[PDB]
């Protein structure tokens, strides 16, 4: 996860994959500007640092 509404309490996990809201204008639940997908995927390499 990259974005959240607020901080997370200790020993608390979340499973929801909704659209994170950053601005004031709602984006009507579709991909666009000022709202993105908070879950993000890792890129792994064998010859990295």
């Amino acid at each position: 996860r990259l974005f959240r509404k607020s901080n997370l309490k200790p020993f608390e996990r979340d499973i929801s994959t909704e659209i994170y809201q950053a601005g004031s204008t709602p984006c009507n639940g579709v991909e666009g500007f000022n709202c993105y997908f908070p879950l993000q995927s890792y890129g792994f390499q064998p010859t990295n640092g």
């Binding site: 990259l2 993105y36 997908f37 993000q40 995927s41 890129g43 390499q45 990295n48 640092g49």
Partner: protein, 214 residues
């Protein structure tokens, strides 16, 4: 011994916010200003970060930066990830009357699965042999991936000495080409039966046969 530690290949993602971390070792990087430099591959470098918080005129506001003191690291964040971002990044600091630069972090990625290799032989002519010299060149091109082995076969025994092979190079055909050179003497050229240069690929083996009779 001030030095800055950062990766070499990060941000390989389309269209979302990612961060790159550069950290210092010998001293605290928060004492002095740290900067990020963006260079065009094969052209003049530029700068995306100065003063550790502000921007040059004309640079888009998609990039952003931050500093944390718990890790002694510098964080640069990129938001837009448009088609313009093909560069490698550096972090530069200042300890005492000297400048230190980062290692570099390359960022590049923001029809037929099998290609038949075309193989050509060039036996020496009369001009080569009259100067006590014999060049047999084994040329290969249009292969994918560029993982091939070049070997030379004589009449009854493979050779080991006198064969040199270069790394494949990127041509203007979305393929690769490699060359192999062999130095030989005329006495064994006429004392053999047939010459062969064989190449091996993934589940493929192409062999050619020539004769000294011309």
């Amino acid at each position: 011994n001030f030095m800055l530690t950062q990766p070499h290949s990060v941000s390989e993602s389309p269209g979302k916010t990612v961060t790159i971390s550069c950290t210092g070792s010998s001293g605290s990087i928060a004492s002095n200003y740290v900067q990020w430099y963006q260079q065009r591959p094969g052209s003049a470098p530029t700068t995306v970060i100065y003063e550790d918080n502000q921007r040059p005129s004309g640079v888009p506001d998609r990039f952003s930066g931050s500093i944390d003191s718990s890790s002694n690291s510098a964080s640069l964040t990129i938001s837009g990830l448009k088609t313009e971002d093909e560069a490698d990044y550096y972090c530069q600091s200042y300890d005492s009357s000297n400048w230190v630069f980062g290692g570099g972090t390359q960022l590049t990625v923001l029809g037929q699965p099998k290609a038949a290799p075309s193989v050509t032989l060039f036996p020496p002519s009369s001009e080569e042999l009259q100067a006590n010299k014999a060049t047999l060149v084994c040329l290969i091109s249009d292969f994918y991936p560029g993982a091939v082995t070049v070997a030379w076969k004589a009449d009854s025994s493979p050779v080991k000495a006198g064969v040199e092979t270069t790394t494949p190079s990127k041509q203007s055909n979305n393929k690769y080409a490699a060359s192999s050179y062999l130095s030989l003497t005329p006495e064994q050229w006429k004392s053999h039966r047939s010459y062969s240069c064989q190449v091996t690929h993934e589940g493929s083996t192409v062999e050619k046969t020539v004769a000294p009779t011309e």
